[PDB]
Point group: none
Protein backbone atom coordinates (compact mmCIF):
# COMPACT_ATOMS: atom_id res chain seq x y z
CA UNK A 1 0.00 0.00 0.00
CA UNK A 2 1.05 3.63 -0.51
CA UNK A 3 2.82 5.34 2.38
CA UNK A 4 1.11 7.89 4.60
CA UNK A 5 1.30 11.59 3.59
CA UNK A 6 3.86 13.80 5.34
CA UNK A 7 2.63 15.98 8.17
CA UNK A 8 1.52 19.54 7.38
CA UNK A 9 4.30 22.09 7.28
CA UNK A 10 5.17 24.45 10.07
CA UNK A 11 3.22 27.70 10.26
CA UNK A 12 4.84 30.61 8.44
CA UNK A 13 6.98 33.23 10.10
CA UNK A 14 5.24 36.24 11.61
CA UNK A 15 4.92 39.18 9.26
CA UNK A 16 7.10 42.27 9.34
CA UNK A 17 6.23 45.15 11.69
CA UNK A 18 3.87 47.72 10.22
CA UNK A 19 5.02 51.08 8.87
CA UNK A 20 5.40 54.14 11.11
CA UNK A 21 2.15 55.77 12.27
CA UNK A 22 0.90 59.02 10.75
CA UNK A 23 2.12 62.41 11.99
CA UNK A 24 0.73 63.77 15.28
CA UNK A 25 -1.63 66.77 15.45
CA UNK A 26 -0.21 69.99 13.93
CA UNK A 27 1.25 72.37 16.59
Amino acid sequence: PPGPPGLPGERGLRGEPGPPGPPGPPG
Copy 2:
Protein backbone atom coordinates in the same frame (compact mmCIF):
# COMPACT_ATOMS: atom_id res chain seq x y z
CA PRO B 1 8.20 -4.88 -1.86
CA PRO B 2 7.08 -1.85 0.20
CA GLY B 3 4.37 0.34 -1.42
CA PRO B 4 4.75 3.71 -3.17
CA PRO B 5 6.37 6.45 -1.06
CA GLY B 6 3.78 8.73 0.60
CA LEU B 7 2.70 12.13 -0.66
CA PRO B 8 4.46 15.20 0.78
CA GLY B 9 2.74 17.05 3.57
CA GLU B 10 0.31 19.92 3.16
CA ARG B 11 1.85 23.38 3.18
CA GLY B 12 1.78 24.99 6.60
CA LEU B 13 -0.59 27.71 7.72
CA ARG B 14 0.14 31.31 6.83
CA GLY B 15 2.15 33.12 9.48
CA GLU B 16 0.55 35.55 11.85
CA PRO B 17 0.31 39.24 10.89
CA GLY B 18 3.24 41.38 11.92
CA PRO B 19 3.13 43.69 14.93
CA PRO B 20 1.73 47.21 14.69
CA GLY B 21 4.32 49.75 13.48
CA PRO B 22 6.06 52.30 15.72
CA PRO B 23 4.42 55.61 16.71
CA GLY B 24 4.34 58.32 13.98
CA PRO B 25 6.40 61.53 13.83
CA PRO B 26 5.59 64.61 15.87
CA GLY B 27 3.28 67.21 14.23
Copy 3:
Protein backbone atom coordinates in the same frame (compact mmCIF):
# COMPACT_ATOMS: atom_id res chain seq x y z
CA PRO C 1 4.37 -3.56 3.64
CA PRO C 2 3.04 0.02 3.54
CA GLY C 3 5.24 2.63 1.74
CA PRO C 4 7.47 5.03 3.68
CA PRO C 5 6.05 8.33 4.98
CA GLY C 6 6.12 11.35 2.62
CA LEU C 7 8.39 14.26 3.46
CA PRO C 8 7.21 17.06 5.76
CA GLY C 9 5.16 19.82 4.18
CA GLU C 10 6.64 23.17 3.25
CA ARG C 11 6.51 25.87 5.92
CA GLY C 12 3.61 28.26 5.45
CA LEU C 13 3.89 31.65 3.82
CA ARG C 14 5.24 34.51 5.92
CA GLY C 15 2.51 36.56 7.58
CA GLU C 16 1.30 39.88 6.23
CA PRO C 17 2.90 43.15 7.40
CA GLY C 18 1.46 44.56 10.60
CA PRO C 19 -0.86 47.56 10.60
CA PRO C 20 0.40 51.15 10.63
CA GLY C 21 1.72 52.37 14.04
CA PRO C 22 -0.16 54.74 16.38
CA PRO C 23 -0.42 58.45 15.54
CA GLY C 24 2.58 60.59 16.57
CA PRO C 25 2.88 63.16 19.35
CA PRO C 26 1.27 66.61 19.01
CA GLY C 27 3.55 69.30 17.46
